[PDB]
CSV table of C-alpha atoms in Angstrom, one decimal:
chain,number,residue,atom,x,y,z
A,1,UNK,CA,-18.9,3.7,14.5
A,2,UNK,CA,-17.5,1.4,11.8
A,3,UNK,CA,-20.0,-0.6,9.8
A,4,UNK,CA,-19.4,-1.0,6.2
A,5,UNK,CA,-16.9,-2.8,4.1
B,1,UNK,CA,-16.5,8.7,4.8
B,2,UNK,CA,-18.3,5.7,6.2
B,3,UNK,CA,-20.0,7.9,8.8
B,4,UNK,CA,-21.2,10.4,6.1
B,5,UNK,CA,-22.4,7.5,4.0
B,6,UNK,CA,-24.4,6.2,7.0
B,7,UNK,CA,-26.1,9.6,7.5
B,8,UNK,CA,-26.9,9.8,3.8
B,9,UNK,CA,-28.4,6.3,4.0
B,10,UNK,CA,-30.6,7.3,7.0
B,11,UNK,CA,-31.7,10.5,5.3
B,12,UNK,CA,-32.6,8.7,2.2
B,13,UNK,CA,-34.3,5.6,3.6
B,14,UNK,CA,-35.3,6.2,7.1
B,15,UNK,CA,-33.2,3.1,8.1
B,16,UNK,CA,-30.1,3.3,10.3
B,17,UNK,CA,-27.1,2.1,8.2
B,18,UNK,CA,-26.0,0.1,11.3
B,19,UNK,CA,-27.7,-2.4,11.5
B,20,UNK,CA,-29.9,-2.2,8.4
B,21,UNK,CA,-27.0,-2.3,5.8
B,22,UNK,CA,-23.9,-3.0,7.7
B,23,UNK,CA,-24.3,-6.8,7.5
B,24,UNK,CA,-26.9,-7.4,4.8
B,25,UNK,CA,-26.6,-10.2,2.3
B,26,UNK,CA,-23.3,-11.0,0.6
B,27,UNK,CA,-22.1,-7.5,-0.1
B,28,UNK,CA,-23.5,-4.9,2.3
B,29,UNK,CA,-21.3,-3.9,5.2
B,30,UNK,CA,-18.6,-6.5,4.5
B,31,UNK,CA,-18.4,-9.2,1.8
B,32,UNK,CA,-16.7,-9.7,-1.5
B,33,UNK,CA,-18.1,-13.0,-2.8
B,34,UNK,CA,-21.3,-14.8,-3.9
B,35,UNK,CA,-24.4,-14.0,-6.0
B,36,UNK,CA,-26.1,-10.9,-4.4
B,37,UNK,CA,-29.2,-12.0,-2.6
B,38,UNK,CA,-31.6,-9.3,-3.9
B,39,UNK,CA,-31.7,-5.8,-5.4
B,40,UNK,CA,-30.6,-4.2,-2.1
B,41,UNK,CA,-27.6,-6.5,-2.0
B,42,UNK,CA,-26.9,-5.6,-5.6
B,43,UNK,CA,-26.7,-2.0,-4.6
B,44,UNK,CA,-23.9,-3.0,-2.3
B,45,UNK,CA,-22.2,-5.1,-4.9
B,46,UNK,CA,-22.2,-2.1,-7.3
B,47,UNK,CA,-21.1,0.2,-4.5
B,48,UNK,CA,-18.2,-2.1,-3.7
B,49,UNK,CA,-17.2,-2.1,-7.4
B,50,UNK,CA,-17.5,1.7,-7.4
B,51,UNK,CA,-15.0,2.0,-4.5
B,52,UNK,CA,-12.9,-0.6,-6.4
B,53,UNK,CA,-12.6,1.9,-9.3
B,54,UNK,CA,-10.7,4.1,-6.8
B,55,UNK,CA,-7.5,2.3,-5.7
B,56,UNK,CA,-5.8,5.3,-4.6
B,57,UNK,CA,-8.7,6.9,-2.7
B,58,UNK,CA,-9.7,6.1,0.9
B,59,UNK,CA,-13.6,6.0,1.1
B,60,UNK,CA,-13.8,4.9,4.7
B,61,UNK,CA,-12.2,8.1,6.1
B,62,UNK,CA,-12.1,10.8,3.4
B,63,UNK,CA,-14.9,13.3,3.9
B,64,UNK,CA,-16.8,14.9,1.0
B,65,UNK,CA,-19.4,17.7,1.0
B,66,UNK,CA,-22.9,17.5,-0.6
B,67,UNK,CA,-26.1,19.4,-0.4
B,68,UNK,CA,-29.7,18.6,-1.2
B,69,UNK,CA,-31.4,20.5,-3.9
B,70,UNK,CA,-34.9,19.9,-2.9
B,71,UNK,CA,-34.6,16.1,-2.4
B,72,UNK,CA,-31.7,15.6,-4.9
B,73,UNK,CA,-28.2,14.9,-3.7
B,74,UNK,CA,-25.6,17.2,-5.3
B,75,UNK,CA,-22.0,16.4,-4.6
B,76,UNK,CA,-20.0,19.6,-4.1
B,77,UNK,CA,-16.5,20.0,-5.5
B,78,UNK,CA,-13.6,18.7,-3.3
B,79,UNK,CA,-10.6,16.7,-4.3
B,80,UNK,CA,-11.0,14.3,-7.2
B,81,UNK,CA,-11.1,11.4,-4.7
B,82,UNK,CA,-13.8,13.1,-2.7
B,83,UNK,CA,-15.9,13.8,-5.8
B,84,UNK,CA,-15.7,10.2,-6.9
B,85,UNK,CA,-16.4,8.8,-3.5
B,86,UNK,CA,-19.4,11.1,-3.1
B,87,UNK,CA,-20.8,9.9,-6.5
B,88,UNK,CA,-20.4,6.2,-5.4
B,89,UNK,CA,-22.2,6.9,-2.1
B,90,UNK,CA,-25.0,9.0,-3.7
B,91,UNK,CA,-25.7,6.2,-6.2
B,92,UNK,CA,-25.9,3.6,-3.4
B,93,UNK,CA,-28.2,5.7,-1.3
B,94,UNK,CA,-30.5,6.2,-4.3
B,95,UNK,CA,-30.3,2.5,-5.0
B,96,UNK,CA,-31.3,1.6,-1.5
B,97,UNK,CA,-34.3,4.0,-1.7
B,98,UNK,CA,-35.3,2.5,-5.1
B,99,UNK,CA,-35.3,-1.0,-3.6
B,100,UNK,CA,-36.8,-0.5,-0.1
B,101,UNK,CA,-39.9,-2.3,-1.6
B,102,UNK,CA,-38.0,-5.6,-1.6
B,103,UNK,CA,-35.7,-5.1,1.4
B,104,UNK,CA,-35.8,-8.2,3.6
B,105,UNK,CA,-34.8,-8.5,7.2
B,106,UNK,CA,-34.0,-12.2,6.7
B,107,UNK,CA,-30.8,-11.0,4.9
B,108,UNK,CA,-29.5,-9.1,8.0
B,109,UNK,CA,-26.5,-10.9,9.5
B,110,UNK,CA,-26.4,-13.2,6.5
B,111,UNK,CA,-23.7,-15.9,7.0
B,112,UNK,CA,-20.6,-15.8,4.9
B,113,UNK,CA,-20.7,-19.5,3.9
B,114,UNK,CA,-23.9,-18.9,1.9
B,115,UNK,CA,-21.9,-16.5,-0.3
B,116,UNK,CA,-19.7,-18.3,-2.8
B,117,UNK,CA,-18.1,-17.6,-6.2
B,118,UNK,CA,-16.7,-14.6,-7.9
B,119,UNK,CA,-18.9,-12.1,-9.7
B,120,UNK,CA,-17.0,-9.7,-11.8
B,121,UNK,CA,-17.6,-6.0,-11.6
């Protein structure tokens, strides 16, 4: 549910 | 928002953003250094630069609206930040689609020490 810097 | 970008990526490519682009190469899903490994990684380099053009915007959380005209992505009018974030995400999703032909699983979970040096936007 987070994944991309 | 990151979640919307992930859905856009899946719609465009058929690949789940996590894990397909969340840890790929030197710039996808996380980094900020090194020579991008391949076209897909360059999509992420440019996307990072694109977000970098928006200091005062919050691309991870700010939601934008878009529609598909036929297959084309059309960003709908929101705040200025939302419009600009949408254009960055749209470009990256198109770029991932345009590169799928050279996407390589060997670059998933690519280790940070193999990414060195600054590359200017």
